[PDB]
């Protein structure tokens, strides 16, 4: 078909960068992060919507791999929060080992420039996002260390309230959007160059974050509220604020977010959501955020990671221009990451103060006095 | 003096690389890791043996900065171990921020090559070590992530027994040296390219580790048992095993480890310990491991980081050749790090299996069956 050859051409010219894939959690579920001697299975998986052969087949340009861990279920909330931090390092570890062990397929990327170099070398640009601020165990220091480990976006919540923001699916509301610590954290996220992800967060938390952020944000995997009313879908008001923020809504393939009857969800529904957003806030603010492996079964025509060429062709068939399809595929999310870097470099260049954790005093006043007396002793030498 | 001009010349030719400095913990003690607007104090500290002005003054070439956190004192050992992991990320964060904020003085290094580039650029090569396997919260995944954060040595214990090895100062013995998990961890430390540090570990743990390691190890801050009997000092048997291991004993300035009466400890005593080791196992297996800021008061003539030229001159004055002084200063620890890299590259090139954490099952058998049935459904499409 001429439209399919057009789709293949676009997939070679620019990278389709998917916003959110849960394959690392499937590796934890199926292999318990032990991939030694499992190459055959990683290329042809016995479960799930992602493997290395189908990843090649669908011509995907890049991927934000999710380092998700569940919300803590421990009654002792101190243990559970700290446990989630340890589990986050487990998931970041298996993501890096997966990339390290398959360099012909995957190449780690943490920037707009590294996405392009990976794509030009014929690799799936492999980026990392965490899914919920419960994963940092109330530690901004840990957050900066996750950034150093390669994390480039943070979903502010998963399906639990945390100290910083309200999740969409949990009622009643804790903070009524963002907490005071959450508002302060947005400044630090902008300063460090961590992309803000508003998927899973409440409607009000989105509104507040979209007004406060000095850098463009994403919805890594959310769909459109006006086409399907759900707590996880983006309202017209928040789409309007996203436009002003310069951010990108990355349309999700979750059946429950695309249709009232999940079994009726299709490729066409995903395209309707992309076109709705593109028409109303411009095709420079819409992306693709599958959430493959966040579900058992995908929509008809989008069953797994091999199906991306059908989506690209489907957009072209509806009359979306090549230039706008290229934007939706990946240029938009690349721009957001680029602008996130630039805002961080500007704030770091100006010398903005970083947010610091509240620590206990380790020394009493007697120890401090001994130290000051000692310092004066060496001064008099 | 001609000997002092000789000392200055050597300090310009090759980097004096100190094995262990506790300045990051002083920053936690004094500033609680908030260094915003504290430049004046970081250059001229009101407490402690380390600041940025004296660091320049003593002509130090490089430094392994300790990311030490105390042994957990929580009665709930699950909370305490996980707490130590969070605190480790706090200390790694402040070390990186300290380096980031003072690039004219400090430059991060994680390799023999990056040490040299830093030194040629006129910076203190700034490396990182953690002090005790209690800091990883029983997670080998966390350990690999600490390596990715820039940690290049791990002291196997501090002053507490952990799951992997016995500390020197604590009795009775838990494992009688290394545990079975500890023996297995040594293989993983060698595979990943993490330098083993045997300071603080029991005599028997050293013996076992020195036989098992496939890469050379260090004592980042230990002195000689035969000159001063202490649990923290290296016996002639372990010095012999260190020679066979190809490792380096980095002589410490702790007064209690240099003399029976702490107030009688001196520069001369440090030189005696260096010469003892150098004479018996060769000057290619001896280094300098101050443990500045692990103590209130240093030896006479080694009160702070400005005093390194006196040590270099003192070694030359005793008849240690320029070539051997250069080795003791830093070429030896550079070689060990170089050999640690090479062993890791060789084992990773051969495709050795990495050690994986023991994880719980997240899916029951019903979920796995649903996933396999779903995979077969998309196969039949
Ligand atoms: Fe999600
Ligand atoms: Fe120590």
Curated annotation (Swiss-Prot), chains A, B:
CDD domains: rDP_like. One of its GO terms (molecular function) is metal ion binding. Zn(2+) binds at residues 20, 22, 131. Disulfide bonds join 71-160. Pathway: Mycotoxin biosynthesis. The keyword 4Fe-4S does not apply. Keywords: Dipeptidase, Disulfide bond, Hydrolase, Metal-binding, Metalloprotease, Protease, Virulence, Zinc. This is Dipeptidase gliJ. It comes from Aspergillus fumigatus (strain ATCC MYA-4609 / CBS 101355 / FGSC A1100 / Af293) (Neosartorya fumigata).
């Amino acid at each position: 078909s001429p439209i399919e050859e057009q789709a293949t051409r676009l997939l070679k010219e620019v990278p389709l960068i998917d916003g959110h894939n849960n394959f690392p959690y499937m590796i934890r579920g199926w292999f318990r992060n032990d991939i030694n001697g499992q190459d055959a299975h990683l290329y042809d998986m016995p479960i799930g919507q992602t493997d290395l052969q189908r990843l090649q087949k669908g011509l995907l340009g890049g991927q934000f791999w999710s380092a998700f861990v569940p919300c803590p279920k421990n009654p002792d909330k101190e243990v559970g929060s700290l446990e989630a931090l340890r589990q986050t390092l487990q998931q970041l570890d298996v993501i890096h080992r997966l990339i390290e062990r398959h360099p012909t397929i995957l190449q780690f990327a943490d920037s707009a420039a590294s996405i392009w170099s990976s794509f030009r070398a014929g690799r799936v640009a492999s980026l990392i996002g965490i899914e919920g601020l419960h994963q940092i165990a109330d530690s901004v220091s840990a957050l900066r260390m996750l950034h150093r480990l390669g994390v480039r976006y943070v979903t502010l919540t998963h399906n639990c309230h945390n100290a910083f923001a309200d999740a969409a699916t949990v009622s009643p509301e804790l903070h009524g959007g963002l907490s005071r610590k959450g508002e302060r954290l947005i400044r630090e996220l902008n300063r460090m160059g961590m992309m803000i992800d508003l998927s899973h967060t409440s409607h009000e938390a989105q509104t507040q974050a979209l007004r406060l952020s000095r850098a463009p944000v994403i919805y890594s995997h959310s769909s459109i509220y006006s086409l399907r009313a759900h707590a996880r879908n983006v309202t017209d008001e928040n789409l309007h604020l996203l436009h002003r923020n310069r951010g990108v809504v990355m349309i999700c393939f979750l059946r429950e977010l695309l249709a009232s009857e999940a079994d009726q969800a299709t490729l066409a529904h995903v395209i309707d959501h992309i076109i709705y957003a593109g028409t109303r806030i411009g095709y420079e603010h819409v992306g693709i955020g599958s959430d493959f492996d966040g579900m058992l079964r995908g929509p008809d025509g989008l069953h797994d990671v091999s199906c991306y060429p059908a989506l690209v062709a489907g957009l072209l068939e509806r009359g979306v221009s090549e230039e706008d399809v290229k934007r939706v595929m990946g240029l938009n999310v690349i721009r957001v990451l680029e602008e996130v870097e630039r805002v961080a470099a500007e704030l770091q260049g100006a010398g903005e103060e970083c947010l610091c954790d509240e620590l206990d005093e380790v020394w009493n006043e007697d120890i401090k006095e001994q130290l000051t007396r000692e310092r004066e002793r060496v001064r008099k030498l």
